[PDB]
Amino acid sequence: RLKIVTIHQEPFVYVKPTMSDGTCKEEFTVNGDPVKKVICTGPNDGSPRHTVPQCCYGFCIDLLIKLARTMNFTYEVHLVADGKFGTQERVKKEWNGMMGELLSGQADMIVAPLTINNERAQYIEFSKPFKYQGLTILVKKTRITGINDPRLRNPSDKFIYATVKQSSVDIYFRRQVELSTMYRHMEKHNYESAAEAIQAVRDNKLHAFIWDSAVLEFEASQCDLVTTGELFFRSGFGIGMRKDSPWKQNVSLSILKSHENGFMEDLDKTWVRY
Amino acid sequence: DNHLSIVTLEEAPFVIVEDIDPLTETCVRNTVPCRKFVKINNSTNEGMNVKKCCKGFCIDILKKLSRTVKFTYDLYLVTNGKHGKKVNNVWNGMIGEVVYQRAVMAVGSLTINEERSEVVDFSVPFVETGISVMVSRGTQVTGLSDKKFQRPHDYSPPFRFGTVPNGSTERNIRNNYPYMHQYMTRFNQRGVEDALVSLKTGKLDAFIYDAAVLNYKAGRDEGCKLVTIGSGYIFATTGYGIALQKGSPWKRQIDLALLQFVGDGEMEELETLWLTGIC
Numbered sequence: 001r002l003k004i005v006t007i008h009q010e011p012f013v014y015v016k017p018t019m020s021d022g023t024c025k026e027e028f029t030v031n032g033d034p035v036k037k038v039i040c041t042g043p044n045d046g047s048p049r050h051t052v053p054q055c056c057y058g059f060c061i062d063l064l065i066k067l068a069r070t071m072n073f074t075y076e077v078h079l080v081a082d083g084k085f086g087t088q089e090r091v092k093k094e095w096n097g098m099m100g101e102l103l104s105g106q107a108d109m110i111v112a113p114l115t116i117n118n119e120r121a122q123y124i125e126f127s128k129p130f131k132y133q134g135l136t137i138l139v140k141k142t143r144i145t146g147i148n149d150p151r152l153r154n155p156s157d158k159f160i161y162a163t164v165k166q167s168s169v170d171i172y173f174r175r176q177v178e179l180s181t182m183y184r185h186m187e188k189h190n191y192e193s194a195a196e197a198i199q200a201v202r203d204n205k206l207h208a209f210i211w212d213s214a215v216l217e218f219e220a221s222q223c224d225l226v227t228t229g230e231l232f233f234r235s236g237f238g239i240g241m242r243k244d245s246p247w248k249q250n251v252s253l254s255i256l257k258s259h260e261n262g263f264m265e266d267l268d269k270t271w272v273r274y
Numbered sequence: 275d276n277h278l279s280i281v282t283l284e285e286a287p288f289v290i291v292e293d294i295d296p297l298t299e300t301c302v303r304n305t306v307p308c309r310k311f312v313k314i315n316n317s318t319n320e321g322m323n324v325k326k327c328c329k330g331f332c333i334d335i336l337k338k339l340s341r342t343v344k345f346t347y348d349l350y351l352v353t354n355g356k357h358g359k360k361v362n363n364v365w366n367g368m369i370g371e372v373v374y375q376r377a378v379m380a381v382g383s384l385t386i387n388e389e390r391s392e393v394v395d396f397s398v399p400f401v402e403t404g405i406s407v408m409v410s411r412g413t414q415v416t417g418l419s420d421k422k423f424q425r426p427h428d429y430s431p432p433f434r435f436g437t438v439p440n441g442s443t444e445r446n447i448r449n450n451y452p453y454m455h456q457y458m459t460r461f462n463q464r465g466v467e468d469a470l471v472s473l474k475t476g477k478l479d480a481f482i483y484d485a486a487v488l489n490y491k492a493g494r495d496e497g498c499k500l501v502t503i504g505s506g507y508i509f510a511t512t513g514y515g516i517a518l519q520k521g522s523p524w525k526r527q528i529d530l531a532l533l534q535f536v537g538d539g540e541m542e543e544l545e546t547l548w549l550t551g552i553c
């Protein structure tokens with residue numbers, strides 16, 4: 001049985017408690033199909049982290065079930081114990097989150113919206129992307145062309161834009177010299193969570209929210225808000241495996257086959273488009 | 275040795291071929307040397323390598339990889355076919371050049387798909403692509419699965435739609451939708467420019483083709499009349515990748531270098547420099 005690590009990240013992985021008999025509540029998609037759910041063990045919340053069975057489903061779980069059937073492997077799913085995707089932190093840096101669990105052997109496969117980047121690829125093997133990634137901008141149903149719009153490039157208090165404090169976006173902007181002016185503007189307005197930032201766009205307190213395009217398109221599926229402009233800072237989400245994994249070739253070939261036959265587009269229409 | 279044979283193929287704006295300055299015989303500005311084999315006549319296979327110059331999105335990527343990965347190269351334009359097709363069990367095109375060890379890598383608008391990945395290794399995708407559908411503004415098509423495409427003779431008159439054959443897009447249609455594929459062949463287009471003219475003049479209702487190229491053409495279309503359905507919607511999302519020989523020693527550093535370019539914002543910048551559209 002392959003040990004799969006995942007993380008709570010809607011709409012790719014939903015995490016919900018089991019029902020009172022320990023099963024997962026039977027539910028259905030917008031297209032009218034039953035939601036496939038797997039039990040995923042993980043923490044519940046300087047407090048003890050009691051690990052309990054929970055119900056996991058979404059884009060990434062649908063993909064896992066496909067891969068498992070297609071490549072004839074068995075699996076057990078758990079939620080990353082420290083709640084993190086995976087950054088190198090110094091104690092001699094060490095990987096936390098899903099990256100550290102994969103490298104330590106606590107997981108054999110990362111199945112999650114794990115952004116492909118150079119730092120992680122130095123240490124692990126990514127598949128070909130199962131979903132292409134980028135940033136976009138969430139606004140009230142307001143035109144912004146994207147990262148090169150004058151109201152972003154030349155910021156003023158008349159048009160407030162922000163992201164999530166300490167997020168990957170926050171870090172990414174701090175890193176590029178050319179984004180210095182936008183970074184300092186966001187720094188004055190960044191929110192503690194995505195949910196709060198999205199609520200502030202609804203309430204005309206934040207005019208534009210810079211965040212992952214898949215999440216933001218998922219959000220615009222409620223609609224008073226919309227995504228706007230061209231995507232920017234694009235990359236992809238891939239399945240993560242150790243360098244030695246005998247699965248990596250067929251995992252990546254299966255992902256190509258699922259893009260090419262429309263399986264992946266179906267996933268987008270079930271979980272991201274509405 | 276770090277001097278590599280690399281094959282490419284003209285397809286603007288990814289690879290743009292220009293004539294060399296004949297006095298100086300040196301490529302300047304943002305271009306690099308690239309040669310093309312041209313036959314003397316139709317009686318024999320004798321030919322000459324013409325010295326030409328190449329530029330574009332993929333050429334800037336090649337130049338950056340040459341610097342960071344530390345190699346030099348002899349860039350040539352493929353003349354045995356185009357991107358890559360298996361004909362009578364023999365790959366031609368850029369894929370064939372790599373499969374048969376005439377090129378260490380293939381750099382261009384080369385789509386990553388499953389069948390090509392069985393015979394070559396691909397780098398990480400360095401730009402997103404897939405299949406899009408271009409129409410004249412107002413033509414209604416829901417997507418590839420529109421029954422105007424799937425069951426074309428359910429409609430009178432039938433929808434007129436085609437692709438440029440022998441690439442990844444036709445391969446996908448042929449595999450997924452056999453009735454649609456056999457129907458489209460009568461609308462096969464010799465190239466993208468032919469197809470765009472056929473669309474603008476009403477001789478074709480839809481043109482199905484590589485998403486990166488179609489969305490670049492829509493952005494440049496005089497009058498902004500040619501559009502990709504959805505709003506640049508991409509079916510069968512994939513990417514352009516560098517093709518390398520199976521088990522190539524260069525793949526790891528190429529991969530890491532391309533991801534470094536992403537991480538430093540340079541791919542975003544290249545995308546804005548070459549692929550921006552007026553429309």
Ligand SMILES: O=C(Nc1ccccc1)N[C@H]1C[C@H](C(=O)O)Nc2cc(Cl)cc(Cl)c21
Nearest residue numbers: 009085113114115164166167168169212215
């Ligand atoms: O930065 C974050 N989370 C975060 C939130 C609050 C504080 C710190 C971090 N998530 C990003 C990056 C994450 C990754 O691959 O590291 N993938 C990933 C995938 C999707 Cl689908 C959406 C996002 Cl936003 C993200």
Ligand SMILES: N[C@@H](CCC(=O)O)C(=O)O
Nearest residue numbers: 357384385441442443484
């Ligand atoms: N980029 C395509 C060619 C154009 C197409 O068929 O869409 C390929 O690599 O085959």
